[PDB]
Design a protein around this nucleic acid. Sequence first.
DNA 1: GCACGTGCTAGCACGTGC
DNA 2: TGCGAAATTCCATGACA
DNA 3: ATTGTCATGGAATTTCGCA
DNA 4: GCACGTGCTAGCACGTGC
DNA 5: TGCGAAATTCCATGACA
DNA 6: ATTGTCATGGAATTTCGCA
Lengths: 366, 366, 163, 163
Amino acid sequence: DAELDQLLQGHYIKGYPKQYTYFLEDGKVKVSRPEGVKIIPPQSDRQKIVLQAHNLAHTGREATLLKIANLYWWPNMRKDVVKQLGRCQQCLITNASNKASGPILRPDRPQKPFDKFFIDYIGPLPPSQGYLYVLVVVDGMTGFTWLYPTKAPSTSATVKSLNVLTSIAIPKVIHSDQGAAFTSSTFAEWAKERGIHLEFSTPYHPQSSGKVERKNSDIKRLLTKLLVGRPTKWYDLLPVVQLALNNTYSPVLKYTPHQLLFGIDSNTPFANQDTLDLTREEELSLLQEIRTSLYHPSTPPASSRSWSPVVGQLVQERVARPASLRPRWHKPSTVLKVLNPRTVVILDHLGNNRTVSIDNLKPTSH
Amino acid sequence: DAELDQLLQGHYIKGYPKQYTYFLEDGKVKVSRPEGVKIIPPQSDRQKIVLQAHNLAHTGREATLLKIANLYWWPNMRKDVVKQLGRCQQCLITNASNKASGPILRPDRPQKPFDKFFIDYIGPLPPSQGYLYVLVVVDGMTGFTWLYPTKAPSTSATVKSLNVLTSIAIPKVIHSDQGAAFTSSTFAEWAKERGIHLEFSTPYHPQSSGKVERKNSDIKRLLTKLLVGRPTKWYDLLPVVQLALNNTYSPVLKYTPHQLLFGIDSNTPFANQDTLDLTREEELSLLQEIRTSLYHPSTPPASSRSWSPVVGQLVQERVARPASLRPRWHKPSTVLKVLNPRTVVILDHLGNNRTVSIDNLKPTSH
Amino acid sequence: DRPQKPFDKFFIDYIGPLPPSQGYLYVLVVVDGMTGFTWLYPTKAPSTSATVKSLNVLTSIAIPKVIHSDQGAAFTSSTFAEWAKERGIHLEFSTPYHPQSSGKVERKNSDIKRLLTKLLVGRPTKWYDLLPVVQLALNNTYSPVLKYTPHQLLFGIDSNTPF
Amino acid sequence: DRPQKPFDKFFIDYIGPLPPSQGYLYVLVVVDGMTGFTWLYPTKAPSTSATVKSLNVLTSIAIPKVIHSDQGAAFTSSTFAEWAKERGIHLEFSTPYHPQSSGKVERKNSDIKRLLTKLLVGRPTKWYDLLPVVQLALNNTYSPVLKYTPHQLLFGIDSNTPF
DNA sequence: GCACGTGCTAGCACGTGC
DNA sequence: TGCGAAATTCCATGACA
DNA sequence: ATTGTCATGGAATTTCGCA
DNA sequence: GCACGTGCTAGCACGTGC
DNA sequence: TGCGAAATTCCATGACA
DNA sequence: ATTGTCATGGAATTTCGCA
Ligand SMILES: [Mn+2]
Ligand SMILES: [Mn+2]
Ligand SMILES: [Mn+2]
Ligand SMILES: [Mn+2]
Ligand SMILES: [Mn+2]
Ligand SMILES: [Mn+2]
Ligand SMILES: [Zn+2]
Ligand SMILES: [Zn+2]
């Protein structure tokens, strides 16, 4: 009853409107409002009340306000409700987000063949010839692809395959996901010896390896079609699949990967002859004209309710593998650096620096 | 060289344009076209050629045409390409669809409490007190919900729970998914004795039980928040969760489920008193005014590339649980009856009648 | 003053011993004072233990402002005292040897006592199974004084089990 | 007539025996006739078995119109005959005791023979490991007659391993 | 040696057939 | 230049994780 | 410390054969 | 008794810490 | 009727499967 | 023979206190 005494005396207090009659009854200070008569508790009591009505079900803004509304009234009640919701640790770490991620970037295509290799593992598959996994290697510019059968997705097996591959040429960058065979020390020491730079996707985000992941689909599709009504023995089909895909038209490019790598068809079925009367040199100059004039898509329009990150903003990381009835979000953290409008470095909950995709972040509410 | 003889003589044949000179060389009949010179094989040879170029990689319309284009030319080549694609069994059963499902129906809300019960099981969960599952029962109109702890999701345990529930009242319809405890003979014989009609969702389609499935979320959310930083012993929290949710505002309704069931708040915290001076009869008449004037949403606008089903159309069912490198679609079947613009009865691959949601169908291409 | 309502006051009392039906001997009668609505929970004892157990089930559905009961052991113990205060329930007791409820409850309580004893004639050994049928019966039985059933006064709707 | 191109004709021949490097004794030299590009596959025998095995690896990358080779056993067997016809490869043979390729291939084949024998001096016991280094070397070694490298004529680009 | 972090697909339960 | 048919391009969807 | 992709088939538009 | 159909969540592999 | 602040409603997103 | 839902918090609009 601090300033509540003043209002009872008829004095004016900024916020509470004057066309309403405020009184005293049963010890408590009330007000006569359209809905009915409501209690006006002192400011000291107000924090406690909002917490008692939230903790009923951990309700959000509107559901909380309606509870308190049944008994009480005061100015800007919601100001005090969101005040508690911003601090109640359990709600912030269990609640889902209602904000979309900003729209995808489409990175420029690598310019020349052998600039960027994208790699990734497939499986475990039905055992064929004692082989279980397939290491898949896609060249960025062409889309050309090599397939290797391994008995495990180890660094050891990944070494031996790239060794046979690299005899043809050596790439500038190799891009992988943070899979354990690809982040080993032994594998980095292998990249160092050959002068190749290693590049890693942000964790729990396969989109980033989308080039090789997309090629895995084409590989499973054709494998499947060729094993219909027959035991699933894939081993001896890998070289057939490698060849068919390498020579198959991307309809929006008008070219096959074989064509973007060599500029001329080999002795495969239905071969393009169109550049028949040209010397090699007139072909090779044409290939460079095509290679710089390929189709490339533009980033899509944002969602009407997306968010995009900023230095010093409060964000929370998606818990990688939460157990049942456990929260899906980590405690809040601060954005240190914004690498692009979809990639970010945070000071995590360890607290180390971590590089994450915004698809595993959410803006902290309030 | 059937009608190819005529064209060589200069006669006109409907389809092949006359401003081009067609000749004979190395035994084969060619044509001089802008792109270069192309072979014109006899109609008898044409089916074989389109199949040889498809089977390279099981390519679709455009990728196939471009292969054949390198060597051949004839009128409406694509007519012959889609002809093979409509019949090549492997492509039809492995390929993905590029057509969206028609837009959801929002069924009218049940009119009075106890018209429709929606049920469903939760778990297995972390063992608490030797209890593993939770049978969840939601009343359509109110949203009011009862929770029961069971040691398994059996008909036996489902019997015993609904028996304690039904002492309060008996519902007209009980709606479940096709889960094995709910489709047992023993359970149907239980429904028969009490005069309740049993109703079943279409299989592999949880949306249909969306009312209870949505309530499972609210149940896990609050359970989670209340077990933060503490061993996950849920058993003794079930009655607390049942109560809090039953008395929590749906912001777009402005009411709690307790309120839509009884018309007045019991002795729970922050109780609505607003109807204080009315007799019971003035309350109960008000409750019916509210119950008929609740919010209800309208079906969303279609996708620019959706499909909606028709009797006698060719469709294919999504294989429920395909093994690896196996096709994701069943052989084509015919639509017998269209129950609503999202529900359909087919003569399957057994061939029995089956009732499916259009979200597990795709229009057969070609 | 203000009109009587549901959840305003519940009346509770024990019936038994009875024939060993499925291992139980008693029944806890709960009756809302404005609706006459009725819950019946069987027990193996007229103890404080069995009362809280049953009533926890009931008060996880709705919660009364007041409980009324005789001065039987189970209600006057200080254990049941601390249970009623945790949940905000005010306690009320009759005076010894002079039972008091209302017109409406005295009669309802009577029927329950009569319908119960009747199945104790017709199907006199196994009564545990028959309770839910009785509760439905009692909650759809029409009241002479008011012109609706307890089910009707509680949910503002007809029943799907008319009697 | 029409200009020479890659994948037009590959030349192939065996080198060995050699010192037991990691269990192998021979090498299969493959050289594209227009590019001078070169693949080297080690084997444990100059047999038809080892030829198909290696060449399957190579012809799952690209496929030549023609193979040329001496009348060594492995190429003139009827097993290798049926392998070349399955894949649409026309076969060509030199005349006995008078080897014939072209200017470009005769010299390349020579270097391979020289660079190989050199590591058979410097690191003379374990050569199996060193092949990939040799192939890179041979495919980035500049040609006097034309003004580009095999790598350059094959991919229309520079290398990341200049030599 | 065993838990952790990152990458993947298996497997259990229930009620009903043969 | 203008018309109808044919060829060629447009682009939402869905699977790879 | 980094970033989605592209085969696919009905729809929508462009071109083309002819006069 | 064991495979099937419908409903659910577990679990294995690899390379690196302590 | 008209103004700025406050209260109240609008509605995309995401999890339940 | 059947069919998505609704809590949530910034944005967008409506109402309200005052003169
Ligand atoms: Mn991977
Ligand atoms: Mn279920
Ligand atoms: Mn008594
Ligand atoms: Mn030789
Ligand atoms: Mn992958
Ligand atoms: Mn469920
Ligand atoms: Zn909270
Ligand atoms: Zn096909």
